[PDB]
Amino acid sequence: HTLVWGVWVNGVDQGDGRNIYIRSPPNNNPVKNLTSPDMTCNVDNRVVPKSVPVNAGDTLTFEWYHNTRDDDIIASSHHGPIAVYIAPAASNGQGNVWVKLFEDAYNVTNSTWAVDRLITAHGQHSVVVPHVAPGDYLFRAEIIALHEADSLYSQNPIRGAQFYISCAQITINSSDDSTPLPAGVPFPGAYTDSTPGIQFNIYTTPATSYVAPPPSVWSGALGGSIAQVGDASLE
Ligand SMILES: OC[C@H]1O[C@@H](O[C@H]2[C@H](O)[C@@H](O)[C@H](O[C@H]3[C@H](O)[C@@H](O)[C@H](O)O[C@@H]3CO)O[C@@H]2CO)[C@H](O)[C@@H](O)[C@@H]1O
Ligand SMILES: [Cl-]
Ligand SMILES: [Cu+2]
């Protein structure tokens, strides 16, 4: 149970984005139905009044929280991966539009899931803004909590992989468009009952065997991190 509070751009806090530049849902409950319209941008997908200006190459940091800013972030039980996707904003997230910019699942070196490291990072994970066409985008940050993912939601709706989905409105101003954004995957649709990484038993199956759901990270993606960029406590 987690939400996005706001974003940072090059280590500068853009301030509370909830219902302002984040298409915030009404609460921190997960989406679980893989065929739900709610898979796009969570349960209250609509245009919000602001879009954060960035340039290609900026560090864009998402900041998550549980109940209040810079708290426990997400229950430690919620082990799983983190991904970020991008789509042109005129799509409203519909159709074959979502392109993956970032994946982090289980780090064998550190013996930790992405969610475990997100807690340590005070809820912060970042991407480099890609060199796509200037204009308005949706950045879809997705945490998958796997603590009940041994079941398919379609078999037992009390369980299943849990999707914490947050769409941020981002405007890319300066970009040379050296990597034009291709068509991508649909949400809902890209994840199905048979997709690798959706049904996974963290109690019996080693995390060293986990394969995160496709699609693969786009060749145009410039990278990212799970690390505290900004200190919310200094404000
Ligand atoms: O026992 C089932 C699993 O519970 C997980 O805890 C979650 C609770 O089930 C859930 O009711 C609670 O929801 C809170 C939410 O955290 C809070 O932010 C909001 O204000 O109110 C909700 C209640 O209406 O969330 C917790 C997760 O934080 C355990 O984490 C898990 O191990 C356990 O299997
Ligand atoms: Cl939960
Ligand atoms: Cu939860």
Which ligand 1 atom lies nearest to the CA of residue 148? 34
Phi first, then psi: what are they for 104, rounded to 5°? -145, 120
Fold annotation for 3-234: Coagulation Factor XIII; Chain A, domain 1 (2.70.50)
Q: Measure 65 CA to ligand 2 centroid, in angstroms.
A: 14
The b-or-e profile of 175-207 (16+ CB within 10 A means b, else e) is: beeebebeebbbbeebbeeeeebbbbebeeeeb
- CA dihedral of residues 56, 59, 64, 70 (deg, nearest 10): -150
Q: Report resolution (Å) to 1 decimal.
A: 1.2
Q: Measure 208 CA to ligand 2 centroid, in angstroms.
A: 23
- The experimental technique used to determine this model is X-ray
Task: Quote the CA–CA distance of 184 and 96 in Å, as a whole number.
Answer: 5
Which value, in Å, is the radius of gyration of the alpha carbons in the chain?
16
Q: Is 31 annotated as a binding residue?
A: no
Given the DSSP bridges, would you call strands 52-54 and 162-172 parallel, antiparallel or unpaired?
parallel
Amino acid at 97: V
Q: Measure 31 CA to ligand 2 centroid, in angstroms.
A: 11
Q: Is 210 annotated as a binding residue?
A: no
Q: Is the CB of 77 under 6 A from ligand 1?
A: yes
Amino acid at 109: T
